[PDB]
Design a protein around this ligand. Structure first.
Ligand code: BOG
Length: 334
């Protein structure tokens, strides 16, 4: 094991291996320091989880987060450099620290302070969909893909994160109707919204609440056809939908007038009401808009990810001991 030191920072008492040095507050389910890794000469992020075992909910979340990050090994997805605890045994086990690459800015920190070239839009979105193929191949649905959940460096390299450094704006329509049985393509909807915005400099659907959101969506893509309406069991949803004057499907070419026409085509295949018909991550990767970036031999899939634990109601000490096992068995990257 290594030797630890304690330090006060912003009311929280930090205790880390000496290998981590120059700790400084980056921000704020835990708080995050930037730190110098003396082992590699690289700057890193060190997140102290707050109250990781406060309850059954926190504890399972803590385990969920550690299981996810141990699994994610892909250039466009946040992954884990280190995890530790000052605890000497399970009996003392009370804090968990997570270490990842220091990510300086999110996609939003870009869009707002620039106007993106088409080639930027191609590189950014290709990276998203490359990691999303990987995420999806693990049978994970991201569910909250939005600009604050995407890390982008000065080199315009991107990774998908679990959590940032308004959600509804990027949420698939089926989610705001509480449909339940989402497939992965709820994340494609979100990618379409992000893309639109990168091209346009404007939020595609700045809904004020969930009802407003559905309104703004139908104006673009138009009222659902017969083949779709017949799948909405909710009487109230049906009535709200049909009460909203029969809206024509706008021409995407006019909404995105001036965009690379191939970006318009891709957008049309992403932002489709019927999630059955939404282009998948792997499909999208082969769309000619990414011809410059696509390489089918460098778009890998994930090892299958065991998420049966999600189906379990366990005791705090059980989630705690599972988490403890995951820390102990962590094997760092190369
Ligand atoms: C915005 C007004 C209506 C939105 C229609 C959304 C159509 C969503 O698509 C539907 O999603 C479900 C998966 O969640 C599937 O069970 C259905 O097969 C699929 O067609």
């Amino acid at each position: 094991r290594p030797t630890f030191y304690r330090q006060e920072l912003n009311k929280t008492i930090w205790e880390v291996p000496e290998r981590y040095q120059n700790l400084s507050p980056v921000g704020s389910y835990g708080s995050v320091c930037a730190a110098f890794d003396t082992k590699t000469g690289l700057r890193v992020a060190v997140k102290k989880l707050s109250r990781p075992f406060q309850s059954i909910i926190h504890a399972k979340r803590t385990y969920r987060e550690l299981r996810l990050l141990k699994h994610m090994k892909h250039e466009n997805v946040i992954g884990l450099l280190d995890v530790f605890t000052p605890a000497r045994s399970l009996e003392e086990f009370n804090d968990v620290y997570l270490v990842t690459h220091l990510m300086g800015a999110d996609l939003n920190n870009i869009v707002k302070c620039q106007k993106l070239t088409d080639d930027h839009v191609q590189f950014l979105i290709y990276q998203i969909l490359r990691g999303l193929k990987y995420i999806h191949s693990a049978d994970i649905i991201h569910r909250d893909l939005k600009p604050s959940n995407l890390a982008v460096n000065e080199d315009c390299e991107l990774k998908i994160l679990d959590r940032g450094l308004a959600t509804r704006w990027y949420r698939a329509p089926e989610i705001m109707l509480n449909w339940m049985h989402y497939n992965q393509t709820v994340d494609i909807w979100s990618v379409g919204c992000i893309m639109a915005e990168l091209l346009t400099g404007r939020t595609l659907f700045p809904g004020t609440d969930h009802i407003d959101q559905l309104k703004l969506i139908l104006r673009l893509v138009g009222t659902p056809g017969a083949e779709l309406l017949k799948k909405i069991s909710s009487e109230s949803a049906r009535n709200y939908i049909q009460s909203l004057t029969q809206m024509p499907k706008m021409n995407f070419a006019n909404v995105f007038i001036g965009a690379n026409p191939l970006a318009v085509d891709l957008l049309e295949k992403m932002l489709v009401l019927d999630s059955d018909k939404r282009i998948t991550a792997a499909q999208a990767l082969a769309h000619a808009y990414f011809a410059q970036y696509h390489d089918p031999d460098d778009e890998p899939v994930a090892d299958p990810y065991d998420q049966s634990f999600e189906s379990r109601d366990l005791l705090i000490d059980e989630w705690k001991s599972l988490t403890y096992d995951e820390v102990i068995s962590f094997v760092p990257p190369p």
